[PDB]
Design a protein around this ligand. Structure first.
Ligand SMILES: Nc1ncnc2c1ncn2[C@@H]1O[C@H](COP(=O)(O)OP(=O)(O)OP(=O)(O)O)[C@@H](O)[C@H]1O
Ligand SMILES: Nc1ncnc2c1ncn2[C@@H]1O[C@H](COP(=O)(O)OP(=O)(O)OP(=O)(O)O)[C@@H](O)[C@H]1O
Ligand SMILES: Nc1ncnc2c1ncn2[C@@H]1O[C@H](COP(=O)(O)OP(=O)(O)OP(=O)(O)O)[C@@H](O)[C@H]1O
Ligand SMILES: [K+]
Ligand SMILES: [K+]
Ligand code: NA
Lengths: 431, 199, 431, 215, 215
């Protein structure tokens, strides 16, 4: 039932938010029932896949519904539900505390309610400050009415790993601007690093006192962003469409930006449709991996990837246990990481299979779109405006399972029968 | 027919191997992991389960078995708790292996359909062969008449059946001869012993 | 060192075959040093990727070298090594018996030499019989010198899951032919099912007496080939390029042939380049799975797929152990399987990444080429003749690792560091 | 310096916490899984290993440590076998915790650099406080000279330093006088002793006992 | 020659290390995981198995070994059931380490090709060295004849071979003289016997006793 409440509550926010976009106030142009359902699902799953341009199709009131759906969907459904109950004064019971444990994927119920106090207070604080930092740049270019709203929309969009942009070019006009680059890359790196990581970073100011998870995320993000920045710069250095007609200073900005955006924001500074096939392949591995076990990002998390990678290498070297940072890792941690990875690959395989039946599109665009939808990144090669009505319905199901997590979606409708009986061992050869 | 044998000891392990040899569906339950692994090949279904728990007993589909044999005869607590559960699950035929006279009396109260003493029935059968070495095997039709498979001595060599007056003098009916040759006989318990002494 | 001997011995047969194919006697046309090495490596790794046509480029002696490479690499390098030792009369030691245990992927050394006698006797028995059955059809069409040889070449090629064919159209002239379809599909199904599965059925004639591995392979192959037959027939029923201008009887034969040929024979009746993208995507999953741990096929095996799939499904159902056919499967089985599947995906991903850098080709053909080379299937969408000198070197590496196995290739250069020390447990969130 | 503590008992676990408190690299080796999980956070590196085995000892890089403290003092076999390994590995300082007289003598033969009796040393210090309740803590400079932190009684209340004849009659020097959380190093004549205060004194061992009985 | 050693104890582990040193293919079987990991480097292949079970015995590949050594000598049940399976498997040579006299009687019945008493045979050899301090090592050719490696006393110092009338008086022939670490096979008359040099002397079992006593 704790996975059932999350699944029901997440879907209802799509349906409730879809009606708010269908109103004539929300949009300038008529909006289809599937485009409104896609944009509602692309916001509460915090993906950023846009059938129609967000700035032009929607009015100010329509974009205010977007910010509400991004904020509610970015921090999780049960995160705001805790605040509502505490405000009204209802007691947070043990039954209500088990939902919060399931929502943050915590193994322990100790201090899980206090983390919601910490994480919501930090989230509203950082989105407010980052808007002020972006206010010094977006206000002289768009006035006070639009510049203040442009900075406020993007601070909520960037921190929650959304990638929605009001402008027709999603951050392609600010390739070389350090103010837009540094502040936004600060938001989705810190917003996707993990809520428990940020709590562990602030309360202990020394690296030796960090938990194993906190040390994994700080080292894992730094290692992965370094390899990704080196790969995009080397592969796309001589490409004419992207990173070719740019200065060496602006080459390093777009290479830095395109390396951190697939995990899992979905902003861009170069056109992904003109990238080489070699760089797109590495982006798929990049955006199949997420960032942070409990954050605003999705996909299989970085700690899941490190656990499986280190467990395989330990086996290949003959070691009998998985050791990261001089810490052994138990069998329940390994099996949950492989259950996430195998379930995610099967669902991505179903999404790629079902789209090739439906869409008449190049294969690399279909593969790039399904990893982007399941990982809730939102990067495109030019397929989302070209989807059919049946093709869009597949992406909505993919984005739903991708944000909610493959395991929690399965636990909703999978019977949990406990049998204490055991069986004799059978030998099978698994070469 | 489907049979369940609970407890794979020397007794229960024999019933699993014999019923599997005849071509029957046998469920072999034992709390010991190494016992089930050995008898896994000799049973249609083998489970490492504790049968004193009702939750584990319902997991096996034990209500689908007409005959359940509880071959636990050294743990009275495990044997009596098991056959109380199976009587609750409305098993038509529960056959229990007992340990002593008091274990027989508990299982008779709590509804065992047949209670078996394998070592006590064999020990009395062995001690009858020890006391009189002429006998080899017997079956008690009643408390006073038996079909004793006697062994022919040296004085019975080269003696015809018509020479023997077992029909009238001893009142014993010879049934078969298995060529000292095995001599199957039937008569009163006191009457057969006369033929053994006088050849 | 048991895995180090296999890698060295398997590499030497590539060198020996490359020398024999590059002689003027064994070919009718000039041959490059890479194309001769590619053809030799594609034969001992038993893949069937042909840069050049086998029928025209090579003489009768050259095709006789190919049959030698297919038979040696199909049955394994160490299988013939033991038979040479036994023919010479030399005793089989414990050290030489450990090499056979490694090559056959057996867990124990109990009866590992007696299996070699059975698998070699069974191989030449069924290759001789099937060559006679193919002769009653091939000989009236191509005479006695060519009809008897072509039947002999294909019976060896089919049994060892090679896919080499003398004709320029690889079995595309026998789409509706029941004699070729039945005999050839009978060969690579039994030739790739596993040597231990055949040995178990030969000595035990009742299904309840089979082991867990034998029941996994017999039931798994039946179910997997039935689903693949249903998928090909439905998706390709309206396709104009393939399966469209065919009779209903021929549609059943071609769908059945294409259901079983990706695991891992690589023969064909239809052009895979004109198939839809939906069938190619399902074939990619199909040829990532092989058949049989000790067989003539490659890829991750059918038992590895089922062990991983059941381990996840049991976890998602809340069960505490993996049970297939009322038998518990231990943790050491689950860990090897994971390594075989994770290492294989990493190598396939590196191949697709390296081919996209090198080759200028559609992305669907690059992914199809790498899965076909790693699983040693040999099916092409039309890329192998168009590969460059740098591209063919990558495929040679992929075919080599695919046949010998990712585990035994890593164990060649991974120093098994033994230590009895342990570490305190670590808590990392892998949700 | 790099320290290794082998055996996380009450004695071994206290050295791990204290050296980690002062900021030192400490390796905590124990054969018990539960002990290592307790001191994993109180040590730079914590390993679950058997120290009587050479293969497990060489895996830790135990040759990189200047000091090894073998805090196994109830298993004589495990304690003596460990320091035989460490002596073979040319560890500069091997400090071993002993159990009885005979365990001390085995470790002396096989080359223990320093042998420690934690409970025997603390038992003697406690038994000096039980015998004489006026003492609180003491340290033996030699077999006849000691620094004793005494406890002031009622007869020493309202008395000055010059009034006390410790320097001349007893031949003992008062070192410091604690006064309710306030300490007076090297008092000058004259300071008034309170009711119950520390009376840190230095002198001959027998001369202090005469001072306690008389005053 | 292929060897399998079942039970890696002090006796079984010594056969594995000595046969592997000579360059033989040794399979080391044990039931203890620590023992198997210890002898991975001293055996061609080391397997964890329980030898009393026949299914685990055929997995090892036990029918391929000409010599099997069952070096279990503390569990009579485990030793006798192992050599019962191996005898039933038509193993040509089974060498079993026994414990007591009744264990020797069981193995003789169930077909052990050779039964070994390592500690009993060494205890008899040691008790000859305790009883007679002159002897160092001896080999019983029979029950009445032996080759004894004696040790030179003070009265044998500066004595030549022909001076010692051992050949006539005792009827014992001196075989070799371990001279100061260098042997002298078949010494010729005469060689000077030093203070402490081994005198390998062959004779009757009673006669060498006279030579030891009379010096
Ligand atoms: N609660 C239980 N459920 C199932 N099996 C059990 C249970 N308790 C014990 N057993 C198993 O039952 C088997 C037979 O029981 P036990 O050994 O106590 O009987 P026994 O009198 O020695 O019988 P036998 O002479 O046939 O060996 C044993 O293998 C034991 O592990
Ligand atoms: N061979 C060994 N290697 C490593 N640690 C060991 C070994 N043997 C024992 N230990 C551990 O050393 C610690 C201290 O040993 P033990 O408890 O025997 O000594 P002790 O005299 O009782 O010590 P203390 O008074 O400090 O508790 C224990 O935690 C014990 O588990
Ligand atoms: N059933 C068995 N199968 C295989 N190995 C066994 C079995 N039972 C015991 N062993 C192993 O045999 C080895 C030697 O046996 P054990 O210690 O009982 O004999 P022992 O006479 O004391 O030997 P030794 O004095 O030479 O060490 C041990 O390492 C023990 O673990
Ligand atoms: K996103
Ligand atoms: K092939
Ligand atoms: Na009994």
């Amino acid at each position: 039932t704790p996975p059932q409440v999350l699944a029901i509550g997440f879907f209802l926010t799509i349906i409730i938010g879809a009606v708010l976009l269908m109103l004539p106030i929300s949009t300038t142009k008529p909006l289809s029932w599937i485009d409104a359902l896609f944009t509602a699902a692309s916001a509460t799953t915090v993906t950023g896949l846009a059938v129609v341009d967000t700035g032009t199709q929607f009015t100010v009131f329509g974009q205010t519904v977007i910010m509400g759906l991004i904020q509610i969907g970015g921090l999780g459904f049960m995160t705001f539900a805790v605040l509502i109950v505490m405000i009204l004064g209802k007691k947070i019971g043990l039954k209500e505390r088990m939902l919060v444990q399931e929502a943050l994927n915590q193994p322990t119920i100790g201090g899980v309610i206090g983390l919601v106090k910490v994480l919501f207070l930090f989230s509203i604080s950082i989105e407010l400050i980052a808007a002020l930092i972006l206010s010094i740049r977006l206000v002289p270019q768009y006035g006070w009415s639009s510049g203040l709203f442009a900075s406020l929309f993007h601070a909520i969009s960037a921190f929650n790993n959304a990638g929605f942009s009001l402008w027709p070019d999603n951050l392609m006009s600010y390739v070389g601007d350090p103010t837009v680059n540094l502040v936004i890359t600060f938001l989705f790196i810190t917003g996707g690093i993990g809520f428990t990581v940020l709590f562990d970073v602030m309360k202990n100011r020394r690296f030796k006192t960090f938990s194993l998870h906190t040390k994994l995320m700080l080292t894992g993000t730094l290692m992965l962003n370094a390899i990704a920045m080196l790969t995009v710069f080397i592969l796309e250095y001589s490409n004419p469409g992207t990173l070719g007609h740019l200065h060496i200073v602006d080459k390093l900005w777009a290479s830095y930006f395109q390396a951190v955006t697939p995990r899992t924001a979905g902003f861009n500074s170069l056109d992904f449709g003109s990238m080489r096939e070699g760089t797109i392949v590495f982006t798929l591995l990049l955006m199949f991996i997420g960032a942070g076990s409990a954050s605003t990002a999705s996909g299989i998390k970085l700690t899941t990837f490190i656990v499986i990678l280190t467990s395989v290498i330990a086996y290949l070297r003959g070691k009998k246990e998985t050791v990261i940072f001089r810490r052994s890792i138990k069998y329940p941690i390994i099996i949950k990481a492989l259950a996430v990875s195998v379930t995610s690959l099967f669902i991505v395989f179903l999404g790629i299979f079902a789209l090739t039946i439906t869409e008449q599109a190049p294969f690399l665009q279909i593969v790039f779109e399904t990893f982007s939808a399941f990982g809730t990144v939102g990067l495109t090669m030019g397929l989302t405006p070209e989807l059919t009505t049946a093709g869009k319905c597949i992406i909505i199901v993919i984005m739903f399972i991708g944000r909610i997590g493959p395991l929690t979606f399965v636990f909703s409708f999978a019977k949990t029968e406990q049998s204490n009986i055991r069986y004799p061992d059978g030998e099978v050869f698994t070469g | 027919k489907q049979f369940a044998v609970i407890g794979l000891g020397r007794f229960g392990g024999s019933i699993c191997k014999e019923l599997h040899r005849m071509g029957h569906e046998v469920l072999a339950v034992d709390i010991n992991e190494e016992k089930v692994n050995a008898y896994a090949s000799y049973a249609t279904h083998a489970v490492i389960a504790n049968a004193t728990e009702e939750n584990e007993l319902l997991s096996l589909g034990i209500r689908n078995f007409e005959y359940v044999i509880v071959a636990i005869g050294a743990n009275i607590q495990a044997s009596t708790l098991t056959t109380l559960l199976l009587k609750e699950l409305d098993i038509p035929n529960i056959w229990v292996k007992a340990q002593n006279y008091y274990h027989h009396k508990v299982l008779e109260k709590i509804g065992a359909d047949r209670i078996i003493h394998p070592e006590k029935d064999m020990g009395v059968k062995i001690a009858q062969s020890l006391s009189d070495e002429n006998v080899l095997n017997y079956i008690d039709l009643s408390d006073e008449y038996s079909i004793v498979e006697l062994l022919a001595t040296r004085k019975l060599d080269s003696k015809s059946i018509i020479d023997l007056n077992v029909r009238a003098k001893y009142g014993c009916t010879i049934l078969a001869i298995k060529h000292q040759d095995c001599l199957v006989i039937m008569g009163h318990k006191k009457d057969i012993k006369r033929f053994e002494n006088e050849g």
